[PDB]
Every structure is written in structure tokens, then in C-alpha cells.
Amino acid sequence: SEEEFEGENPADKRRRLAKQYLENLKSEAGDLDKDIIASRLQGRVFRYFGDKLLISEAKQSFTRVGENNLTCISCFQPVLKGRLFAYTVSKDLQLTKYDITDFSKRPKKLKYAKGGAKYIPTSKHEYENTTEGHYDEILTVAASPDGKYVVTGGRDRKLIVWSTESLSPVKVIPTKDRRGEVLSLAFRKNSDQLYASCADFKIRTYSINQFSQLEILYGHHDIVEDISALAMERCVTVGARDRTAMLWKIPDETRLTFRGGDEPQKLLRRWMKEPLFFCEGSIDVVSMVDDFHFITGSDNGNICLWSLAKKKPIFTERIAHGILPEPSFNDISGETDEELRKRQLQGKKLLQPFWITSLYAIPYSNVFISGSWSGSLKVWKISDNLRSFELLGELSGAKGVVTKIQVVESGKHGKEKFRILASIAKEHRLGRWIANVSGARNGIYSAVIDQT
Amino acid sequence: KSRMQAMEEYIRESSDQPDWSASIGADIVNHGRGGIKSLRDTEKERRVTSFEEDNFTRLNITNKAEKRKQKQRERNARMNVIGGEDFGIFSSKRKLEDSTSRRGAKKTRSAWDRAQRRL
Amino acid sequence: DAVTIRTRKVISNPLLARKQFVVDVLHPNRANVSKDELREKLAEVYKAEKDAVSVFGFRTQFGGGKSVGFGLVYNSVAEAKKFEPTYRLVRYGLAE
Amino acid sequence: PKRLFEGNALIRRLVRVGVLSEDKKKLDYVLALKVEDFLERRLQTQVYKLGLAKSVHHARVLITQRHIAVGKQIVNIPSFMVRLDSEKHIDFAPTSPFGGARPGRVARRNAARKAEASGE
RNA sequence: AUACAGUGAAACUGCGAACUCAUUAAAUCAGUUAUCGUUUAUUUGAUAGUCAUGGUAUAACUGUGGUAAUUCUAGAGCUAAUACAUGCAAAUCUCGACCCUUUGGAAGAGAUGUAUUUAUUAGAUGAUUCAUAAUAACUUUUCGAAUCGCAUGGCCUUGUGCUGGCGAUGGUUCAUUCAAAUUUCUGCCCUAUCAACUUUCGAUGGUAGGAUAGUGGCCUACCAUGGUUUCAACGGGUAACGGGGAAUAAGGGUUCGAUUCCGGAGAGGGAGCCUGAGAAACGGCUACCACAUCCAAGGAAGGGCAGGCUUACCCAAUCCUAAUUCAGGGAGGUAGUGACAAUAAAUAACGAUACAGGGCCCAUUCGGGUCUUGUAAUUGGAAUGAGUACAAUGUAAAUACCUUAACGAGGAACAAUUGGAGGGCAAGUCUGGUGCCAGCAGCCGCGGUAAUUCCAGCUCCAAUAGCGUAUAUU
RNA sequence: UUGCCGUUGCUAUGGC
């Protein structure tokens, strides 16, 4: 054995011995019964419309909003009086309700609720934090699929459930932790169940109709920025600097962990065998294409397509939105000599890419939209073999930081009309790190796309 | 019988398939006294829960089997398992080459068999 | 404060005419849930009577918060009488 | 093969326990491991290092009085070994008065006595 | 309920009732056959034509009595059966001349249970004297429903005629299933300080018989003579509490667990017998032998196991046995007394103030080194485990576990031990002296026991729910 | 369509 295979490297010996081990176990090692039991008792992508879409002829309507820094937008669409609604939460502690039903017209504001400094609790003892309003900034909002409730959460460490008709709070739920700020909310589709991702490394599940908390899941090394969930009782969360994506089975309290593990030296070697490679700092946004595939955007611009069966990403589109502009040469140094200023620019090293601030995948479909503060949303199509995606179109209507993207449908099965609403803000919803982006207004950006 | 855990660990590296880890706090035997549940303990507990959920009965602890389990498995978990990872695997005297050897059919004894394998 | 009930593996047995399901009872800030109130809740969910509903075998998780058990819902009260064992009938008070 | 597979296995599980660093993946570094490397993984030491307590004795008192919860469950054993995945999730229990709960019996008796004195 | 009709004691009937002590190496056991060489309670599938209803004999039950007395008894009186005993020519076919008239109607000629024993005669299987069909007989010779509950059936003949459906329990033979008995080959230690064994319960065959459920020297007559082997027949030892991949394993102990078969005999000891589908019965009976018990001294009945140097709850689960869903199971499950080997904690954690000027390390001494240390000082709120205890869960029921409100610390008296080292004290005691010393020591002094607040409870060290001693030993 | 301001329509988008 060893004499026959003496030429092998140590890793080659490990591989062949693993192969022989697996063969030995397969050599050494009721279904109808299970079938007839299951008779007494997960979906792929079914809608393919990437190629049918026309994007350049689609309208672009950007509606200004008086609120500062619109953090999030959540759209309610009825499921077969047929009205389609939206709810926008800002850093000005304001939740605004809009009707988006008429695709031709601009969205129409119905009412608004604004929290203020009067909602600061006097006790501050972490379970007396049951005030009706928000006293700190609201990061995220979700609209219940049945349509009676809208849920707001933010840095005030509480979830407020509001009735949609009166826009008044029917419930306030403290997170009961000093450290946990609710970053993202995701309703299970066609369900009352809500999954909240908090900054205390937790995912809290609530049943909204009973206003109860089912259980809490503990998984991340860093804060859990974004959570996305389809119809079945499971969810996908992303943490920022642990650089992992986690698929949680809610009833079984188990998780699949996905790690990127990209090496810029390896990419440079691959290109030399065949540019700027930025190593990945944090994963921010996640979306579910179907029950087997999900897509994540990072801060180095990478959009990654992940399957449940593979730990590594299937596909990675690097620097998807672009590279930030070079800093001003007269600003960087402050010396009289322009050649010294150009040297202090230090060439290509100070270039940094755009962060994917928002990313939405239309469920069970090949179209997904990525948004950053480059001044253009991007529409991508997943190929039919589901290994890669390409860029269909670019929507240049919106200018500014794209915090949240939602898509709604109103049409016949032969001909569907899609409205894309992005809550454009001057700043990132988490912090004020991004500076002086040019020509950015707080508002709602709507693109209406009709298939051929 | 021929399954060995160092082999299983290397296979879990070389798969590329995610491995369904549990949550952080659910692994702890009661309040940290027993410790973190080992992977074999979690698999056996999953099998028992599936069995109970299928037959709609929860197993009462048989005296002899329960005494044997509490005498052996708990003592082995305290002695070897350290924070959910067992280290008596290295003190054990079992041999990896007995499992990793071909040992039977397709052992490649013939020179023409080796030539056919090369081809 | 309201308890939450999740039903899994619901199987209909027409020979017994029962509905057999594993019950996950999730109870934050509560010790445990009484079987009578739980029979009320499952009765209202499955639109059968409490006398038709039967539960047993509840095991409470370490740290509380989740009790897992087994539940049988019948279609008729008299049929629940003639199929249910005498000891669970005594527990439920339905029969002497 | 015994050296290959069991050395890789031993190094990986020592890393997951946390006594051995990620960049220290060698058998001679496994040999250079010492007792204090394991003793720093104790929950008493970890609570002190993370700073929930002002000393190791305060940390032991907090653990035995059940304020510290590692992950979901309250751990009340100071000799609980803490892994890499758990050391971030060590925190105060929700039931504990220190994190997000009602004050204990001492504070409640003192508040009730002060209220009775105010009423008197 | 003008036969009984509900529920049913007793009784009859039916079914089931198949621990101890000894150690064998072709014996046992394990497989593997065979039964064209056998037996069947049950299950399952088949199977039977060859009086509108017979006669008793008793129990339970009445009563009269005998005995010291037994589940002991005698006399008289009662009535039941799925108990016991008894017991019933027509119809179906073949050959149908002829008739019409083809299907058809018919002169006529003929045939016709089962079992037992034997003789004789003609479809399966590789194979039969087997299945089956006959013929003449034979039998202390059988079997071929005198039974039961749910329905009140359909005709017209309203006769109260005909016969009407679902089921019980029977019964014949064959098959099946469950077993069992024999049988076949294949396999297990050491040894020649064990070479002849068998006719020394016939040894190897043949014929006939007896016997058995049946083959067979299994037995008996008669007759031949054989059968086994230094390649070890045969014999001895085997710690043979052994071995069997018998057995689930060892889900990372170096070969280890757990389960199953041990093989036989007995149920005060020899012997004979009986009931059943199945026993040479853990049942009963007789005689014999030995114990031993009650008695009114006439008689009567009986058969140990655990302990030292034994209980309670229950058929809920698992499964089995009955006329049977239901009953029952010291099978089986559950619980209790039972540190011992050994476990994871706790016995406090943070502060604040005041006061003091010394604290510690090394070194034979001489000395040297060092620097926020000492205090039986005061004081503040916070935390919670042991516990006390409400519930639900849990289970046949309960305990326990899981969860769990309400209480739960300053002497934290919610009162940790075990060992080691070193002082010091008196109007005190003893001993030796070259004044005033030295030694041994000292719970004992002089008053005082509500009497006295005293080296403040003398200081320091180590292990800690553990910690010493003695002896042996590396 | 905007908290405010400015421009363009009388609707489009520049500034804070």
C-alpha cells in the first residue's frame, strides 16, 4: 500500500485514505412504510421573468420627504380594499404611512406618527421601558402580511406594534436587555410570526397576534444587522464582523454557518494565471432567493450567491457598485508642491469600494436589486442553472444612500407590473460615517417596470 | 464499528457542506455541571427524541441500562470531554490504518489490477 | 403572558378516528401550563370539545420556556369514551 | 496516517476549546501548552476578564449566585470551560437584577421599609 | 315474563394448570438433514343424506344424626343438561329404446355412507405395497347434531301449514400450524509415566415375533459370526463455575461489556400406579422406611425457603393464559430502607471613613536589604445560596426529576473541621544546689461560683469536607 | 413632491 503510493504528498495521502475509509464504510454498511406514514400526514424558483423585463423605458419618480435620514421602508401588498401600502421610518423618530396603489401617480401620504423626547421613561430600569412612543431613532419597520399591524423598532430597545387604521400603538414590547438594539425585522410570509435581530447577538421571535415571544436564538460574534425569512419557519441572518451567514431552523434551534474566506492574494494569483482586490470587512445585507439560495452584500462591494449545500459561495461579483472617488489632491496633503500632493495620494492604495447598503431579492425569482450610494440601483438576473448572475439593468433615478429596497406587484399573471421603492437617505441608517454625498435628498424612489 | 472520529472530522473539513450546529446555550448539560454535550450525545438524544415522537411514548428509565449508562457515559464525559470536545480519542489504543486500509475487494494485489486502476 | 402552542406531525388516524400531534407549548415567565387550560386551548383551535381533546406525556425543557408533549383530538365524546383508557378518563374527570 | 489525522484532529479541537490559537497550529505548540492556558478558560476567569466582575472572587460569587448566563442557560459552575463560540455570548442573565430584572430581596425589603417609614 | 326471559351465590359442565444438589471432552452443544419411519389440544383450509323431540341418575338444596375432630361422615327427601344413557326408505346419478324435436321429455335396465382388522383386485413422486377406487368378511367399534341466542322471515294453504336469515358449541377424516421424538453429516483440551477395546444389560449382523406413536438388537427366540483401531481405538487428568462468533456488542477499554444454552437429577427417601394433545407430573393414590403433629389415648392429618457468624403499590406498560374485550398473572412494572468506592458547589462579595508609625525579607552574630503598611477601629447599602413553602408537571397512583410563585443574612449564632509550631502568667506546687540559681512543670493561687470580665478567646502555620495515628511495604 | 430656501412649471430638481 505505502510502497505502491510512496510518491504521494501528505495531503494526497490524506485524500486517498479518506477515499478508502469512505469506501470501507460503504462496503460495511422501510421506505415504503415511511411513505405510507407520510401519506397520512420547500420550493425552488418558479417565476422566471428576468429576460422579459424592459428596464430602460421604466419610469423614475423621486418623491421628496421632509424627514431626515429615512432608515427603512416596508411595503404591504394584499394576497388574493385591495390597496397597497408602504410605511417609512426615519431618524426623526417618525413613521409615515403611504398608499402606493396607483403605479402611475406618486405615493400619497395618509398619516404619520412622530415620537419625541416626551417618551423618555422616568424609571430607566430596563423593564419599565414600555412607553407608547419611540424616544430614540427608529432603524427598521415591518408590515404584517394580514395587514392589521405595523411594527417599528430601533435604538430605543423596544418593538412597538401599531394598528394600521389609527396609526396608534396597540402594544409595546421591551427587549428587556441593556445592550440590545433592534436592527432588522422580518415577518414570516403569510404568517403573524416576526423575527427581530438585535445587537446583543440575539434573534427574538414574536407572535404578533398573541403579542407573545416564542423563543430567542443566540448565534453571532458581532451584531446581527439583517435578517430575511421566507414562508417556511426558518430565517437567514448576517453578522457584521464575524463575516458569517447563518440559516436558522426556528423549531429545532439549529443553524448552518456559511463563511466567505476570500483571499486577495489568491485572487491576484488567479488573475496572473489568467486589478484591485479589496478584502471583505463585513457582511451587511441578506436576501432569500428561494428556500435553497440566498444572496449577501458586503462592504467591499461583493454580492455573493450562496446555496445551502455549499459552505463557500457559489458566485461572487466583486466591486459590484464601483470604487469611491479619489480624495482631492489639494485637500489630502496641504503642501505647496502638487507633485508632493500627488505622491501623498499614494496611488491606488487609498481607493475603497462602495458598500452594498441595500439588497432585495424578489422571492422565488431570478431578479434581485442592489443599492448603494453610487447614485444608481442595479437589477441583476440569476441564470437558469442558478450558478451565476448577470447585470440586466441600471436604474439611475435615485441619488443618495439606498437604505431599503422593496418590490410590489400589481398585474395579471400574463403581464405583471413591478414597483421598486427605495428609501433614499443622506446617511447610513446605522451611523453618520458616510460624508457629504453629492446631490442626495431624503425621499422615496419609485421605478415602475412592465414586462414585454 | 469502523467509524472513527478523526476520520469523521477530516471528512467534515473536506466536505464543503455545512454541518448543522446547535445554538450556543442549548448544548449545556444542566447549568454547566455535566458540561457541553458531545456530538455523539447530541446525535443519540436526537435519535431518542425522534423515537419518542414517532411512538408517542416517553421511555421510562430501565434500572440496569440506566445504571450502566450513569456509571459509564457520565464518567467518560467527565474524564475525557473538555468543553464539548473529547480527548480520550488519543489515549485510546485503536488503530486508524485498520479502517483506512483497503482490506478486501479492490485491494489491488495483481499487477494487471494496478494497470487497470491506472488506466 | 399568553401561552403559545405549536402543533407538529399532525396525523389523522381513521381507525381510531383521532388526530395525533406533538405539542410544543412555549411559556415565557410561567412555571408550566395546566392540562385543563391546555385542553381548552387545543379544543378551541381544533374546534372540538375538551372532552374530545386528550393530552399527555409533557416534558419540560431545562430552564423552562418549552414543554413538549403528545396530544390526541377525537371527533366524538362517546367515541373518546369508548377508546380512551380508564386512567386518562379518571385524570380528565370524564369518567369515574 | 496516525500522525496526520490525529494531529490535525487534536489541533482542531484544541483550537475550538480555545487554549490553542488559530495561528499556532502545530504539535510542538500543543506540547508548549501549559496549565494556565486552560485555567484562563474557566468561567470565573472569563467573567473577570470580560469585566462583568471586579475580581475573580466577585466573578465566582456572581456565578454561584446564578447571575451569569453563558448563551441560553444560566451556568452556576465556576469551573465551566468556555469555548471560542461562547466567550462572546457570556453575559448577565435576564433574570438577574444586574441585567434587566426586578431588584432582589434586600432591595425590596429596604424599599418597603423606607415606604413604611414615609407613610409613618 | 299467565314455560323461562333482568342480574345472578352455590353446584353441575367445559378449558387451562407440561428451588436445591451432582460435572460429562463424538458425550453434550452448535449447525445440518431425514420422517416414502412417527404422534396432535389448538389455529387455518377442506370435508358427512346412504322425531311437533326418548329414558334416567345426582349435585347445589331440604331435613334426621354420629364424632374430641379434619376439605370427616351415614339415613331419608328433591328436581336440570353441550352431564350420562337412548334413538329416527327417499333422493341423486349412468344406460336411457322409442317419441317427437331440436335444447327436450320418457318405456325401461341398473347403481349407490364412514371407521376398525385382514385377505384379494387396479393419482402423485427422482422413487413405494403411497393417495384413491374396488371384492369377501370382521368389530365387546366408532362417527353420521334430541344443543344454544339474536332476528320474526318469505309464501298463501291463513294453514296457526310451509320454511327464513345471521351467529355459537359440536363431530368425522385429511392437510396446515404448534411442538416433539428419533436420525444424518460436520466441528472442542492434555496425554502412550494409557495398545488393545467389544460378545462382562447383545457385542456385529440375519430371520420371525413382542413392544412402541413409529424406524430400530429396543427386547425375545433361532442362526451365523463379527464390529473399532498405533492414522491412538481405549483409558487417565481437565480448576468441564466450562465452552459455544450462542450472543448484542466493544459508536476510539488493546481484546472489554451485556445477553443466551450450561448438561443432569430431585422436590423426606426406595418401589409400583393414574390423568392429559403434551409428564414416567413441583399433582394425587397404595405399600414400605424414617421423621414429626393434634387427641377426650378410641384415632387423625402432614412435608420447606430465606437470615446471622423476607416489605408496600399495581396489571398502566411488555406479554401470556381462560367460556374470554372486561377476569388473572410474587410473569412483569414501581417505590422504600441501604455515608461506604465519589461527586459539583457554599460557608460571603464590593465599598467608605477614622486612627497609628512602623511592616516585612535575609543572615552564626556583627548586621544587612526594603517600602503604604498596620488596626479584636468604625460605617454604608447591594447580592444570593442552604432552607421554609404554593402550585402545576410527572405516574395505574405516588415518590423523584423538570419548571416554579411566597418567604429566606451582620455574630451574616444560617455558629468547618483536622493537625502542627512557639510562647507567656501566680503571695501557687515539686525537685536539686557553692546566697538572689537551675530544673521539672503549673485547670490546683487567698477570698469568691452571680463569683469574676481577666495573656480581650495567647500568637502563628498548613491542608480543607475533609484531616490525623499505628503497622507493613518501594 | 419638500422642515426650510432657491429655481423651473403654475410640474421637474438645486441648497441647508
From Swiss-Prot, chain A:
Keyword Acetylation listed: yes
GO biological process, one term: maturation of SSU-rRNA
Modification type Phosphoserine: residues: S1
Family designation: Belongs to the WD repeat RRP9 family.
Subcellular location: Nucleus, Nucleolus
Name of this chain's protein: Ribosomal RNA-processing protein 9
Cysteines joined through disulfide linkages: none
Record's keyword terms, sorted: Acetylation, Coiled coil, Nucleus, Phosphoprotein, Repeat, Ribonucleoprotein, Ribosome biogenesis, rRNA processing, WD repeat
InterPro entries for the chain: Rrp9-like (IPR039241), WD40/YVTN_repeat-like_dom_sf (IPR015943), WD40_repeat_dom_sf (IPR036322), WD40_rpt (IPR001680)
Oligomeric and partner information: Interacts with UTP25. Component of the ribosomal small subunit (SSU) processome composed of at least 40 protein subunits and snoRNA U3.
Keyword Phosphoprotein on entry: yes
A Gene Ontology molecular function term of the record: U3 snoRNA binding
Role, per record: Involved in nucleolar processing of pre-18S ribosomal RNA. Required for efficient pre-rRNA cleavage at sites A0, A1 and A2, and biosynthesis of 18S rRNA.
GO CC terms in record: 90S preribosome; box C/D methylation guide snoRNP complex; nucleolus; nucleoplasm; small-subunit processome
Gene name of the record: RRP9
Domain notes from UniProt: The WD domains are required for nucleolar localization and U3 small nucleolar RNAs binding.
The species this protein was found in: Saccharomyces cerevisiae (strain ATCC 204508 / S288c)
First and last residues of every WD repeat: 133-172, 177-216, 219-258, 278-316, 352-390, 397-443
Extra information: Present with 5130 molecules/cell in log phase SD medium.
Any Pfam family hit: WD40
Source taxon at top rank: Eukaryota
UniProtKB/Swiss-Prot annotation, chain B:
Biased composition (Basic and acidic residues): 110-119
Protein name: U3 small nucleolar ribonucleoprotein protein LCP5
Intracellular or extracellular location(s): Nucleus, Nucleolus
Gene Ontology biological process: endonucleolytic cleavage in 5'-ETS of tricistronic rRNA transcript (SSU-rRNA, 5.8S rRNA, LSU-rRNA); endonucleolytic cleavage in ITS1 to separate SSU-rRNA from 5.8S rRNA and LSU-rRNA from tricistronic rRNA transcript (SSU-rRNA, 5.8S rRNA, LSU-rRNA); maturation of SSU-rRNA; maturation of SSU-rRNA from tricistronic rRNA transcript (SSU-rRNA, 5.8S rRNA, LSU-rRNA)
Record has Transcription as a keyword: no
Organism, scientific name: Saccharomyces cerevisiae (strain ATCC 204508 / S288c)
Shown residues within the full chain: 239 to 357 of 357
A GO CC annotation given for this chain: small nuclear ribonucleoprotein complex
Keyword field: Acetylation, Nucleus, Ribonucleoprotein, Ribosome biogenesis, rRNA processing
Ranges for region Disordered: 63-119
Task of the protein: Component of the U3 small nucleolar ribonucleoprotein. Required for the early cleavages at sites A0, A1 and A2 of the pre-ribosomal RNA. Participates in ribosome biogenesis.
Primary residence: nucleus
Miscellaneous note of the record: Present with 1430 molecules/cell in log phase SD medium.
Biological classification of the source: Eukaryota, Fungi, Dikarya, Ascomycota, Saccharomycotina
Curated annotation (Swiss-Prot), chain C:
Predominant subcellular localization, coarse grouping: cytoplasm
Keywords (A to Z) from UniProt: Acetylation, Cytoplasm, Isopeptide bond, Phosphoprotein, Ribonucleoprotein, Ribosomal protein, Ubl conjugation
Reported modifications of this chain: N-terminally acetylated by acetyltransferase NatA. Also partially acetylated by NatC.
Segments traversing the membrane: none
Note in the entry: There are 2 genes for eS24 in yeast.
Subunit structure, interactors included: Component of the small ribosomal subunit (SSU). Mature yeast ribosomes consist of a small (40S) and a large (60S) subunit. The 40S small subunit contains 1 molecule of ribosomal RNA (18S rRNA) and 33 different proteins (encoded by 57 genes). The large 60S subunit contains 3 rRNA molecules (25S, 5.8S and 5S rRNA) and 46 different proteins (encoded by 81 genes).
Family statement: Belongs to the eukaryotic ribosomal protein eS24 family.
Protein name: Small ribosomal subunit protein eS24A
Natural source organism: Saccharomyces cerevisiae (strain ATCC 204508 / S288c)
Lineage: Eukaryota, Fungi, Dikarya, Ascomycota, Saccharomycotina
Encoding gene, per UniProt annotation: RPS24A
Full-protein positions shown: 3 to 98 of 135
From Swiss-Prot, chain D:
Domain S4 RNA-binding: 41-115
Disordered, as annotated region: 94-120
GO annotation, biological process: maturation of SSU-rRNA from tricistronic rRNA transcript (SSU-rRNA, 5.8S rRNA, LSU-rRNA); ribosomal small subunit biogenesis; translation
GO CC terms, sorted: 90S preribosome; cytoplasm; cytosol; cytosolic small ribosomal subunit; nucleolus; nucleoplasm; small-subunit processome
Covalent cross-link (Glycyl lysine isopeptide (Lys-Gly) (interchain with G-Cter in ubiquitin)), residues: K114
Source species, domain of life: Eukaryota
Subcellular location: Cytoplasm; Nucleus, Nucleolus
Assembly mode: Component of the small ribosomal subunit (SSU). Mature yeast ribosomes consist of a small (40S) and a large (60S) subunit. The 40S small subunit contains 1 molecule of ribosomal RNA (18S rRNA) and 33 different proteins (encoded by 57 genes). The large 60S subunit contains 3 rRNA molecules (25S, 5.8S and 5S rRNA) and 46 different proteins (encoded by 81 genes). Interacts with snoRNA U3. uS11 interacts with MPP10. Component of the ribosomal small subunit (SSU) processome composed of at least 40 protein subunits and snoRNA U3.
Name of the protein this chain belongs to: Small ribosomal subunit protein uS4A
Organism the protein comes from: Saccharomyces cerevisiae (strain ATCC 204508 / S288c)
Parent-protein start and end of this portion: 67 to 186 of 197
